Amino acid sequence: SGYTEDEKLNIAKRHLLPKQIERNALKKGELTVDDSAIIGIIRYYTREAGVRGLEREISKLCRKAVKQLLLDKSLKHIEINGDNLHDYLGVQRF
């Protein structure tokens, strides 16, 4: 059976998020995604036993953040949590 949310969170924290931050041309402390945002991604933007939808949205997350820093160099770091997640990912899906 499918991952629990704790499981998904650990996979996101150890792998998904480091991998996508890199890919999206972000440096180490330019982007903070707290645990309440990943959960939020899990609960409202995915519907799945594994983590590919989780990964897709984390990716979209990092892509938007890097475009934010590009479109405004007065930004040094982006903070995402459960409350502004939808500003990056749009209208919740589920």
JSON list of C-alpha atoms in Angstrom, two decimals:
[
{"chain": "A", "resi": 1, "resn": "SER", "atom": "CA", "xyz": [0.00, 0.00, 0.00]},
{"chain": "A", "resi": 2, "resn": "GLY", "atom": "CA", "xyz": [0.62, 3.62, -0.63]},
{"chain": "A", "resi": 3, "resn": "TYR", "atom": "CA", "xyz": [2.89, 5.97, 1.12]},
{"chain": "A", "resi": 4, "resn": "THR", "atom": "CA", "xyz": [1.61, 7.55, 4.27]},
{"chain": "A", "resi": 5, "resn": "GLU", "atom": "CA", "xyz": [1.81, 11.36, 4.36]},
{"chain": "A", "resi": 6, "resn": "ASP", "atom": "CA", "xyz": [4.75, 11.09, 6.77]},
{"chain": "A", "resi": 7, "resn": "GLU", "atom": "CA", "xyz": [6.42, 8.84, 4.23]},
{"chain": "A", "resi": 8, "resn": "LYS", "atom": "CA", "xyz": [5.84, 11.26, 1.36]},
{"chain": "A", "resi": 9, "resn": "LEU", "atom": "CA", "xyz": [7.09, 14.11, 3.44]},
{"chain": "A", "resi": 10, "resn": "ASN", "atom": "CA", "xyz": [10.31, 12.33, 4.15]},
{"chain": "A", "resi": 11, "resn": "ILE", "atom": "CA", "xyz": [10.82, 11.47, 0.52]},
{"chain": "A", "resi": 12, "resn": "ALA", "atom": "CA", "xyz": [10.08, 15.06, -0.47]},
{"chain": "A", "resi": 13, "resn": "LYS", "atom": "CA", "xyz": [12.46, 16.40, 2.15]},
{"chain": "A", "resi": 14, "resn": "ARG", "atom": "CA", "xyz": [15.35, 14.08, 1.39]},
{"chain": "A", "resi": 15, "resn": "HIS", "atom": "CA", "xyz": [15.07, 13.78, -2.36]},
{"chain": "A", "resi": 16, "resn": "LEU", "atom": "CA", "xyz": [12.30, 15.55, -4.22]},
{"chain": "A", "resi": 17, "resn": "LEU", "atom": "CA", "xyz": [13.01, 18.95, -2.92]},
{"chain": "A", "resi": 18, "resn": "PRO", "atom": "CA", "xyz": [16.85, 18.94, -3.15]},
{"chain": "A", "resi": 19, "resn": "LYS", "atom": "CA", "xyz": [16.65, 17.52, -6.69]},
{"chain": "A", "resi": 20, "resn": "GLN", "atom": "CA", "xyz": [14.10, 20.07, -7.94]},
{"chain": "A", "resi": 21, "resn": "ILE", "atom": "CA", "xyz": [15.73, 23.07, -6.36]},
{"chain": "A", "resi": 22, "resn": "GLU", "atom": "CA", "xyz": [18.88, 22.23, -8.19]},
{"chain": "A", "resi": 23, "resn": "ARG", "atom": "CA", "xyz": [17.20, 21.66, -11.52]},
{"chain": "A", "resi": 24, "resn": "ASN", "atom": "CA", "xyz": [15.45, 24.99, -11.36]},
{"chain": "A", "resi": 25, "resn": "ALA", "atom": "CA", "xyz": [18.69, 26.83, -10.95]},
{"chain": "A", "resi": 26, "resn": "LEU", "atom": "CA", "xyz": [18.20, 27.76, -7.29]},
{"chain": "A", "resi": 27, "resn": "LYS", "atom": "CA", "xyz": [21.14, 27.91, -4.89]},
{"chain": "A", "resi": 28, "resn": "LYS", "atom": "CA", "xyz": [21.00, 26.39, -1.36]},
{"chain": "A", "resi": 29, "resn": "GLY", "atom": "CA", "xyz": [19.26, 29.00, 0.74]},
{"chain": "A", "resi": 30, "resn": "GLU", "atom": "CA", "xyz": [17.42, 30.91, -1.98]},
{"chain": "A", "resi": 31, "resn": "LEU", "atom": "CA", "xyz": [14.24, 28.91, -1.41]},
{"chain": "A", "resi": 32, "resn": "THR", "atom": "CA", "xyz": [12.67, 27.62, 1.79]},
{"chain": "A", "resi": 33, "resn": "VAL", "atom": "CA", "xyz": [9.67, 25.22, 1.44]},
{"chain": "A", "resi": 34, "resn": "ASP", "atom": "CA", "xyz": [8.50, 24.37, 4.95]},
{"chain": "A", "resi": 35, "resn": "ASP", "atom": "CA", "xyz": [6.94, 20.99, 5.85]},
{"chain": "A", "resi": 36, "resn": "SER", "atom": "CA", "xyz": [3.47, 22.60, 5.98]},
{"chain": "A", "resi": 37, "resn": "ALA", "atom": "CA", "xyz": [3.75, 23.47, 2.27]},
{"chain": "A", "resi": 38, "resn": "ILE", "atom": "CA", "xyz": [4.68, 19.92, 1.17]},
{"chain": "A", "resi": 39, "resn": "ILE", "atom": "CA", "xyz": [1.77, 18.58, 3.15]},
{"chain": "A", "resi": 40, "resn": "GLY", "atom": "CA", "xyz": [-0.42, 21.15, 1.52]},
{"chain": "A", "resi": 41, "resn": "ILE", "atom": "CA", "xyz": [0.94, 19.91, -1.84]},
{"chain": "A", "resi": 42, "resn": "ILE", "atom": "CA", "xyz": [0.18, 16.41, -0.79]},
{"chain": "A", "resi": 43, "resn": "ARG", "atom": "CA", "xyz": [-3.36, 17.21, 0.39]},
{"chain": "A", "resi": 44, "resn": "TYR", "atom": "CA", "xyz": [-4.67, 19.62, -2.31]},
{"chain": "A", "resi": 45, "resn": "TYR", "atom": "CA", "xyz": [-2.64, 19.17, -5.39]},
{"chain": "A", "resi": 46, "resn": "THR", "atom": "CA", "xyz": [-2.20, 15.49, -5.72]},
{"chain": "A", "resi": 47, "resn": "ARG", "atom": "CA", "xyz": [-4.24, 12.28, -5.49]},
{"chain": "A", "resi": 48, "resn": "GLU", "atom": "CA", "xyz": [-1.97, 9.26, -5.55]},
{"chain": "A", "resi": 49, "resn": "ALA", "atom": "CA", "xyz": [-0.37, 6.28, -3.80]},
{"chain": "A", "resi": 50, "resn": "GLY", "atom": "CA", "xyz": [3.22, 7.14, -4.86]},
{"chain": "A", "resi": 51, "resn": "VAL", "atom": "CA", "xyz": [4.96, 10.53, -5.31]},
{"chain": "A", "resi": 52, "resn": "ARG", "atom": "CA", "xyz": [5.15, 11.46, -9.00]},
{"chain": "A", "resi": 53, "resn": "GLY", "atom": "CA", "xyz": [2.30, 14.04, -8.71]},
{"chain": "A", "resi": 54, "resn": "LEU", "atom": "CA", "xyz": [4.14, 15.24, -5.54]},
{"chain": "A", "resi": 55, "resn": "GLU", "atom": "CA", "xyz": [7.25, 15.69, -7.56]},
{"chain": "A", "resi": 56, "resn": "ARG", "atom": "CA", "xyz": [5.48, 17.48, -10.42]},
{"chain": "A", "resi": 57, "resn": "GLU", "atom": "CA", "xyz": [4.08, 20.11, -8.09]},
{"chain": "A", "resi": 58, "resn": "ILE", "atom": "CA", "xyz": [7.35, 20.53, -6.17]},
{"chain": "A", "resi": 59, "resn": "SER", "atom": "CA", "xyz": [8.93, 21.12, -9.58]},
{"chain": "A", "resi": 60, "resn": "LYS", "atom": "CA", "xyz": [6.33, 23.64, -10.55]},
{"chain": "A", "resi": 61, "resn": "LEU", "atom": "CA", "xyz": [6.95, 25.20, -7.12]},
{"chain": "A", "resi": 62, "resn": "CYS", "atom": "CA", "xyz": [10.66, 25.63, -7.77]},
{"chain": "A", "resi": 63, "resn": "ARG", "atom": "CA", "xyz": [10.08, 26.88, -11.32]},
{"chain": "A", "resi": 64, "resn": "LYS", "atom": "CA", "xyz": [7.80, 29.62, -10.17]},
{"chain": "A", "resi": 65, "resn": "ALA", "atom": "CA", "xyz": [10.19, 30.63, -7.42]},
{"chain": "A", "resi": 66, "resn": "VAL", "atom": "CA", "xyz": [13.17, 30.93, -9.70]},
{"chain": "A", "resi": 67, "resn": "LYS", "atom": "CA", "xyz": [11.03, 33.00, -12.13]},
{"chain": "A", "resi": 68, "resn": "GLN", "atom": "CA", "xyz": [10.11, 35.25, -9.14]},
{"chain": "A", "resi": 69, "resn": "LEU", "atom": "CA", "xyz": [13.74, 35.91, -8.37]},
{"chain": "A", "resi": 70, "resn": "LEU", "atom": "CA", "xyz": [14.44, 36.52, -12.01]},
{"chain": "A", "resi": 71, "resn": "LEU", "atom": "CA", "xyz": [11.62, 38.99, -12.37]},
{"chain": "A", "resi": 72, "resn": "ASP", "atom": "CA", "xyz": [12.80, 40.98, -9.29]},
{"chain": "A", "resi": 73, "resn": "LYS", "atom": "CA", "xyz": [16.48, 40.94, -8.14]},
{"chain": "A", "resi": 74, "resn": "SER", "atom": "CA", "xyz": [15.47, 42.81, -5.04]},
{"chain": "A", "resi": 75, "resn": "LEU", "atom": "CA", "xyz": [14.44, 39.34, -3.87]},
{"chain": "A", "resi": 76, "resn": "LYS", "atom": "CA", "xyz": [17.13, 37.30, -2.18]},
{"chain": "A", "resi": 77, "resn": "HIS", "atom": "CA", "xyz": [15.15, 34.37, -0.88]},
{"chain": "A", "resi": 78, "resn": "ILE", "atom": "CA", "xyz": [11.59, 32.95, -1.20]},
{"chain": "A", "resi": 79, "resn": "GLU", "atom": "CA", "xyz": [9.68, 31.45, 1.65]},
{"chain": "A", "resi": 80, "resn": "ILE", "atom": "CA", "xyz": [6.77, 29.06, 0.97]},
{"chain": "A", "resi": 81, "resn": "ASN", "atom": "CA", "xyz": [4.51, 27.47, 3.56]},
{"chain": "A", "resi": 82, "resn": "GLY", "atom": "CA", "xyz": [0.97, 26.10, 3.85]},
{"chain": "A", "resi": 83, "resn": "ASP", "atom": "CA", "xyz": [-0.58, 29.62, 3.61]},
{"chain": "A", "resi": 84, "resn": "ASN", "atom": "CA", "xyz": [0.97, 30.98, 0.40]},
{"chain": "A", "resi": 85, "resn": "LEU", "atom": "CA", "xyz": [1.34, 27.71, -1.44]},
{"chain": "A", "resi": 86, "resn": "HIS", "atom": "CA", "xyz": [-1.59, 28.49, -3.67]},
{"chain": "A", "resi": 87, "resn": "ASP", "atom": "CA", "xyz": [0.09, 31.65, -4.76]},
{"chain": "A", "resi": 88, "resn": "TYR", "atom": "CA", "xyz": [2.57, 29.38, -6.55]},
{"chain": "A", "resi": 89, "resn": "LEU", "atom": "CA", "xyz": [0.48, 26.41, -7.43]},
{"chain": "A", "resi": 90, "resn": "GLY", "atom": "CA", "xyz": [-2.79, 28.07, -8.22]},
{"chain": "A", "resi": 91, "resn": "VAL", "atom": "CA", "xyz": [-6.33, 26.93, -7.29]},
{"chain": "A", "resi": 92, "resn": "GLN", "atom": "CA", "xyz": [-6.37, 23.73, -5.29]},
{"chain": "A", "resi": 93, "resn": "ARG", "atom": "CA", "xyz": [-7.18, 20.68, -7.33]},
{"chain": "A", "resi": 94, "resn": "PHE", "atom": "CA", "xyz": [-8.44, 18.15, -4.70]}
]
